[PDB]
Structures are given as C-alpha cells and as structure tokens.
Amino acid sequence: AHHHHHHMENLYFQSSFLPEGGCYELLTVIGKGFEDLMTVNLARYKPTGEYVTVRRINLEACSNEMVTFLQGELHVSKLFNHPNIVPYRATFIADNELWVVTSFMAYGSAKDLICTHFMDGMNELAIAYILQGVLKALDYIHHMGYVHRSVKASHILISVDGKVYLSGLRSNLSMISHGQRQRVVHDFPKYSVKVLPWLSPEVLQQNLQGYDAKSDIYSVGITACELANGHVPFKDMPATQMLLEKFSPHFHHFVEQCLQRNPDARPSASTLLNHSFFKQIASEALPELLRPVTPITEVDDWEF
Amino acid sequence: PFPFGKSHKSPADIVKNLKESMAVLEKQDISDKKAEKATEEVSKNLVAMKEILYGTNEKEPQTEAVAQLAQELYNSGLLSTLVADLQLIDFEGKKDVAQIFNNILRRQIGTRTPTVEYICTQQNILFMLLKGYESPEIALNCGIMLRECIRHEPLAKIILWSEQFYDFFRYVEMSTFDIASDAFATFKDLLTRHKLLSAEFLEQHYDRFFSEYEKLLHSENYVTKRQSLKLLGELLLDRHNFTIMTKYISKPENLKLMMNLLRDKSRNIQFEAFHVFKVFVANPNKTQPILDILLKNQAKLIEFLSKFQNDRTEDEQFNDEKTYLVKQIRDLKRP
Ligand SMILES: Nc1ncnc2c1ncn2[C@@H]1O[C@H](COP(=O)(O)OP(=O)(O)OP(=O)(O)O)[C@@H](O)[C@H]1O
C-alpha cells in the first residue's frame, strides 16, 4: 500500500526508445554478425534526430534454438546496468525481423580501429585504458554469477567521448543452477565458431573439467595480444589449436598472468584491476590516443 | 566514496530496518533527503538479506541465520510489501528482491514447502506479479519471480483458474519484445509443466481459452503467430489433452485456419501448421463438416502435399507423415 500511483506523471518528463520500426531511418551498414544473419545499421531516431545503432536479424532464417538463444541475450542485457556495459534501448519485431536498438559508439570497436589505422596494433597506454573498462565490466558480470564467453576486440566499443563498453552479451552464460551458484559449468558456447582463438583451454576441451569466470580472464590476455599486435594469436590455425594453447615489463606480467594454464592460478578481474599495468593511467585521454582517426558526429486456393 | 566499516546485524533487526524504510518510501510527502536516506537503507538491507541467503564468495549460507530470516520475513508480511512496493526500489534492489524471493520460495523443510503454504494465504502476491508485466520498470523482475512461483502446482492452479490469466493474451503481444517473450515463457510453462492441472484447465475453460487462442493465430506479429502455432501442436499431441484435442479437430473453422496457414509466406509457419493439420486427417472419427472440407479439396490436397517442402530432406517423420496423409485423403469415399 503506497502513495506513488502518480508515477506515470512522476516521470516521463525526461529513457526508452519507441519500440516501433518507423521511428528509425536506416543509414549505413556499420557491421555484420551472428553467423552472417545480423546486419548492424547506423540509424537516425526520428523523434530526436539522434544517432543510434539498429541490430537486425531475420528470424525466418533462424531455427527454434537460435530464437531461444537470441531471447536469452535480451533477458541478460536488461539485468545489467554498468558504465562499461553497452546499454540496450529498445527491442521489437519489425515483422519477420528482430530489431535491437543500442546507443551508437562513434569510434566503433577496437577491431574497427585496428583495421582503419592501427593495423600494426595500438599504443600501450591506449590498451591500458581499454582493458581497464573491460575489466570493470567483467567484475560486475562475474559478481552477478555470469561468464561472458566472448571477450575480444570486436566486442569492445568506444564512444564519441572516449568511454569504453563491453558488448557481446549474446554469449553470456549463467552458472546459477537450481537457485545456487555452480563452481564450474559445462556448456559449449553455441554459434561461437570464430571466437575459438580467444577461448581458454578448459572451455575448449569439452567433456573435461569445465570452467568459471577465470576463463574470461584468459580471453582478456588474448585480447591484450590482439590489441598489441593487431592480429589474434592462433589465427587461421586448424580446430586443434588446442594443443598449442596447452612494451613495458608490467604489460608482459599482466599478459602472462591472464594466460596461465591453471585457471585457479589466474587472478580475478577485481585484483587484476590492482595490477601494476594500470598504474600508467579516461574520457579525454583516449580520444587523443586514437588520433588521427576521426569519428563522425503453386496450387490454386482452397475452396471452403 | 569514503570506505566505512560494516556493523553486523541480526536477521530480525534487518527485517525491522527494511519494514521501517519501506514505510518511508511509500509516503509522498517527505523531503528529497529523507526519501534518499530511505532509498539507501532499503538497498543496503536487501543486499544484507541476499547475503544471508546466498552467502558470499567466501562464506556459504548458515541454516540458523536463514531460518531466523525466513521466519521474520513471514511474520512481517514483507514478502507481500516488497512485491507491492517493487516500483519504489532502485534498479539493483529490484533484482535483489527477486533473488531473495526465489530463494525463500525454494525453501523446503522435509517434504513441506513453507513459502508455497504462505502464498496460498496471501494470493494477491501472484496477481501483483502478473500485473507487473504492464510496467516496464518492474516487468522483468516480476516475470522472474512469477516463473519461480508457478513451478509449484498450488500457485500455478491459482493463476490458471483466475480472471487475470486471460491478461496473458494481451501481454504476449506487447510491442516491447523482451517483455512479450518473458510473458509467453510464463504462459507456456503454465500450460505445459503440470500436465494434469493444465488438462483440467483446458477442459473446463475450453471455449474462452480457444477463443482467445484463435486471436494469437491471426496475429500481425510474426513471432506471436510462429510460437503460438508451435505451442498449439505440442498441446494437441500431448496424451493428457486427448479430450481437448478431439474437440478441437472436430470444428470446421479450425481446419479452415490450419489449411490457410499451410499457404502462409513463412516456411516456418506452414511447417508448424502441418503439425496441427496432420491430426485432423489422421483422425479415424471425422465429423461430417470436417469430412466435407477434405472431400471438397481432395485433388488439391493430394497435389499440395506431394510438393510440400520437398527440400526438407532427412526428416523421416515428416516424409512418412506426408505419404500417410496423401493415402488417407485419397482413401476418402463419398457416400
Ligand atoms: N553500439 C555499436 N556502435 C557502433 N558499432 C557497433 C555497435 N554494435 C556493433 N557494432 C559494430 O558491428 C560489429 C558486429 O556487431 P557484434 O560484435 O555485436 O556482432 P557479433 O554477432 O557479436 O559478431 P561476430 O558474430 O562476428 O562475433 C561490431 O564489431 C562493431 O564493429
């Protein structure tokens, strides 16, 4: 029994985007994913003229399992609210397609940046700012009893004012079974052929011991190598890249810690944030480090 | 943020603190600082309660603390108050309410399940959770809580036999797809988990349910139509629903609709239509109006079925089913 039924009016003087296709004017394709079934569009939100991202997937090309997998992403993304996790703004059917609207990050992904300019890898200070944001996000995701399962450069987005966001929530997996946290989980990440090189040995070797949040920590290290070199380790290497999986000195010790064979030996994201590597340190330091990249501102019918 | 120490508090004092802080939040006529203070206190108490029930990364929950807490929670009516006032709570506290609620609900002393017993004395909790779908700020957390409630048969029965159940037909077609999906998940669980209960519900409310269900099959929303058509097939092929199924497949207008959905533009839709259509024809005791529709389109159906998703190549059930339906329809004699 409360006295806040004037809430509709209490705020709406502001929020959500209208969950209707017509509100968006599609401009350029800015990206592609979900096994080539998703088109990522830059869009104009008509009621404000503001720029947004529209993610589009034809549900007719999806199996039942693929639709379930996709609805899971929408559930998990509404549970998360964090300065370094990409916000979702609207989700609706524009018929036959799932439309998912998120805020537009004007420097694109860390991989985009590598491809447009930093082909040989990014400067080290930049990597520290970028990986700190990823780690803050992972700390939150891990405290919530989730594993990310797809930390890579293309799942790190940078906004007009240099804020870093972890994306890629589609691959997120709960370890909470029967109301309780499980020490290890066993699910092989579905539709992740391509994410393999960032995956820890214990996620890859299915039917063995299983994994926890410290598997994401290994992916942080792979990403560190990807960001330094401009290419991911084990690229073009056959599926049995497994076997082989079995700059300032602080950076080296950072990477070597993430990449330990034993996950129990790997530090958590919170203690990794206290690592020497980040002492060299955000929304005014990164845009400059990204110079000279500029963002833009048959049969006839039945008879009855 | 200046890092003060945390002083230890009993479950009883935590319940008390939260009760008093919730009372402040319900009031309109308080200063911004007083509201802010109560907001912070609610939040901190909820974190404290969660940690008693789940423990931490360092400590597992201890039974004495848990039992004191559950007892206190039942005596105070706070399980009702937190659902009723859910809108007044911060983003992360709303998720804490869900977790606390879910954990208490799973609580099990012997064979007994005490929270189920308690919600049976306090049934508006269920109806407040269901109504939560209409409010974007609380909908997801309400859904999570409701879906844990309906795991228990007595609570499932209360919702199924209510007027409010039919609100689901609105909720599953909501234009925010995350909430519509959540609601359809709860709706499907209700109809499929406790199969005896569901069979009884369908027999007793046949006409209203299928009148509402018919509207879903006409939906302008592609997923609503696809999902609903799929659930329909799964419902009719279930042995618990045999009586309901025999009623359904005797009505001319239902055959009409399935036959039409076989000619939909969506390959997925026409395949899920097949799953229901096949049952009308496999039926050895076809009524006259049904028999009339099949004989009227005898030649067209045989032709249609011969060329129906022929590229669907190693589904051996689908292939044999199509062969069977063609034989059946060919074997139809006009008296
Ligand atoms: N909010 C955004 N702002 C700017 N660009 C974006 C945004 N979201 C996605 N993109 C672009 O689209 C690309 C593909 O999107 P995303 O990574 O979400 O798809 P994916 O299915 O996870 O990719 P893959 O299947 O290749 O792993 C991103 O790497 C990025 O370049």
Author numbering:
A (entry chain B): -15 to -2, 60 to 291, 348 to 382, 386 to 401, 425 to 431
B (entry chain A): 2 to 336
Which text from the study accompanies this structure?
The pseudokinase STRAD activates the LKB1 tumour suppressor by forming a heterotrimeric complex with LKB1 and the scaffolding protein MO25. In humans, there are two closely related isoforms of STRAD (STRADα and STRADβ) and MO25 (MO25α and MO25β) that similarly interact with and activate LKB1. Unlike the majority of kinases that require phosphorylation of their T-loop, LKB1 is activated through direct interaction with STRADα/β isoforms. MO25α is composed of seven structurally similar α-helical repeats (named R0–R6) that form a horseshoe-shaped molecule with a concave and a convex surface.
Here, we report the structure of STRADα as part of the STRADα/MO25α heterodimer. With the help of chemical lysine methylation, diffraction of these crystals (retaining the same space group and unit cell dimensions) improved to 2.35 Å. The structure of STRADα exhibits the classical bilobal protein kinase fold, with the N-terminal lobe (residues 59–152) organized around a central β-sheet, and a C-terminal lobe (residues 153–401) that is largely α-helical. A well-resolved molecule of ATP was observed in the cleft between the small and large lobes of the pseudokinase. Met83 replaces one of the conserved Gly residues in the glycine-rich loop, Arg100 substitutes the catalytic Lys residue in the VAIK motif, Ser195 replaces the Asp residue in the HRD motif, His200 substitutes for the conserved Asn in subdomain-VIb, and the entire DFG motif is replaced by GLR (residues 213–215). Consistent with the lack of the DFG motif in STRADα, no Mg2+ ions were observed in the STRADα-ATP complex, despite 1 mM MgCl2 being present in the crystallization mother liquor. The β-phosphate is tethered through interactions with Arg215 from the GLR (DFG) motif, and His200 (subdomain-VIb), basic residues that may substitute for one of the positively charged Mg2+ ions. Although the activation loop of STRADα (residues 212–245) is not phosphorylated, it is well ordered, a feature normally observed only in structures of activated protein kinases that are phosphorylated on their activation loop. Strikingly, the crystal structure of the STRADα/MO25α complex reveals that, in addition to the interaction through the WEF motif, a major additional binding interface involves the STRADα N-terminal kinase lobe and the MO25α concave surface. The αC-helix of STRADα runs along the concave surface of MO25α facing the H3 helixes of the MO25α repeats R4, R3, and R2 (termed the “αC site” here).
